[PDB]
């Protein structure tokens with residue numbers, strides 16, 4: 001539902017995983033691109049903080 | 054995508070397909086739900102360090118999962134480390150003389166051309182040797 | 189990062205500032221004499237280093253310095269004349285390279301004993317040869333006519349371990365199958 | 371290459387060989403190319419005050435001309451005569467121009 | 476859909492074998508600037524390098540694969556193209572099993588072994604690509620021979636998955 005969708009997305013971005021994963025093909029496409037986005041963005045945060053320090 | 058070369062990205066995609074297919078194969082013909090679709094989802098989630106809903110239970114599934122986990126850890130760390138390197142790393146006459154990508158010239162029949170022609174200083178002799186031959 | 193942050197000589201000062209690479213000159217040459225009698229800060233520093241450094245940085249012949257740089261595995265920087273440097277860098281085993289500009293500007297001359305009767309004619313001959321393009325042609329003949337992202341190689345081991353693991357997993361599956369099927 | 375087939379000044383080749391030939395043609399003289407024995411260009415030893423190499427060969431009378439890449443310097447100009455330069459140059463630095471490794475990760 | 480599954484398996488087996496054999500034979504793996512005996516644009520493959528322009532155009536020279544145990548082994552493995560050839564051999568045997576399945580429907584393991592050959596062929600293909608790229612490293616672009624190898628890998632893996640589905644459904648249907 002909408003509240004569990006928000007929780008799944010938040011946990012994915014914080015790399016904390018979840019208690020439910022999408023089972024359909026459309027849910028898994030959405031989950032996969034959000035996982036890729038999360039990986040690039042968090043690596044970019046750590047890398048640029050290392051540069052600044 | 055710049056931190057890793059195009060060949061690394063292409064081989065990551067191939068390795069992903071091969072891992073998913075071998076996980077599906079060893080799981081179907083094994084005493085003891087990894088169909089092909091679920092195998093692809095397990096592998097994608099493993100590479101994105103996002104975990105999953107199912108983990109392999111057999112010895113062969115766990116060997117496949119373990120080496121894919123190790124590969125993922127090395128490749129993701131390599132991406133972050135090289136991005137940190139790129140983000141952490143002429144402005145002179147010597148700099149202009151040492152390189153060859155930028156062409157440099159003078160005014161014809163001018164004091165500067167005469168200065169470079171009759172120079173005895175190392176750097177300016179190197180500069181004149183280049184300028185006289187440049188075409 | 190320490191890697192990308194690394195840099196080459198690119199100038200004389202960068203050779204003078206460091207001390208890990210030894211740099212020498214030819215013994216009994218104009219370059220040694222130029223360094224000895226210099227009053228320029230960088231050149232005086234270089235000379236004070238070269239005279240006192242042990243073992244002797246100097247060499248006996250140009251070929252000797254060339255082989256010393258080729259066999260010092262990038263720990264020796266030879267100071268020689270630009271013409272010889274250019275000619276060498278144009279020939280195999282082309283593993284040597286000229287760095288940066290010149291340090292000064294000078295020229296070769298045809299010498300004669302003081303008070304010689306050949307002095308005047310030789311000067312006029314050199315001017316004739318220069319104005320007729322002979323020296324240019326000889327130079328062109330003897331010099332010119334002689335003539336980062338991580339790569340798959342940086343992570344190839346992890347690919348080989350991965351595919352080896354997949355192969356091992358398939359073998360273990362077959363063994364388990366044959367065991368549990370009997 | 372294969373100097374054994376030749377003898378005398380014709381045993382050698384190179385820029386200065388042709389330059390000596392052309393100078394001899396213009397000045398009108400015959401010459402024999404003697405290689406310096408020391409194999410050194412030339413310098414005044416501060417202790418003995420003796421010139422060695424080609425400059426020594428020129429000053430002491432053993433040679434009448436030097437057609438080597440001999441740099442024009444003030445110390446040499448005080449003891450031997452030089453013509454106008456026939457080639458320009460400067461002091462320059464020469465430096466030597468790593469497989470990652472399968473398990474380098 | 477067993478008829479369509481067998482059609483896909485046979486057509487895919489032939490396609491993978493054809494693409495991989497052409498790739499191993501043709502000479503458009505890499506566009507670089509080397510020399511067929513000045514440097515000009517060339518087009519190398521697994522065995523020969525050729526000039527793409529100029530006078531010596533069309534002239535090809537055997538690649539001197541050879542000029543540190545690891546460097547020696549990589550150069551040896553890349554010189555003999557062991558892995559691309561092994562992947563061609565395994566695709567051939569997989570094709571033989573797929574064809575033999577129909578003429579002998581008594582034995583089930585025949586199509587399973589076809590699937591396993593195709594999967595193994597894909598893995599050999601991957602090791603070949605890695606060895607090739609790594610050995611080259613020791614400007615440029617990749618030609619159509621390279622991509623024929625890559626597409627052979629993808630099709631081989633798809634045909635393996637389909638073959639294993641056929642075997643699984645035969646045992647599931649017959650057992651129950």
Ligand SMILES: CCCCCCCC/C=C/CCCCCCCC(=O)OC[C@H](O)CO
Nearest residue numbers: 115116117118119120123349353472473474
């Ligand atoms: C219970 C299930 C577990 C099974 C699955 C677990 C897989 C996880 C680890 C894989 C890496 C193992 C291989 C590590 C690589 C060794 C390389 C090495 O020893 O290199 C020698 C060195 O290079 C000399 O110079």
Ligand SMILES: CCCCCCCC/C=C\CCCCCCCC(=O)OC[C@H](O)CO
Nearest residue numbers: 028029030031032033036054090093094097
């Ligand atoms: C069973 C699972 C179902 C699968 C679910 C799908 C989600 C896959 C995840 C993300 C990767 C996509 C991101 C990569 C996008 C490729 C495009 C790109 O990188 O463009 C580069 C460009 O070509 C410049 O050269």
Ligand SMILES: CCCCCCCCCCCCCCCC(=O)O
Nearest residue numbers: 054059062063065066069096097100
């Ligand atoms: C589970 C593994 C799959 C992960 C997906 C990662 C996305 C890979 C994208 C690769 C595209 C190749 C293009 C290289 C980019 C370039 O050279 O410009």
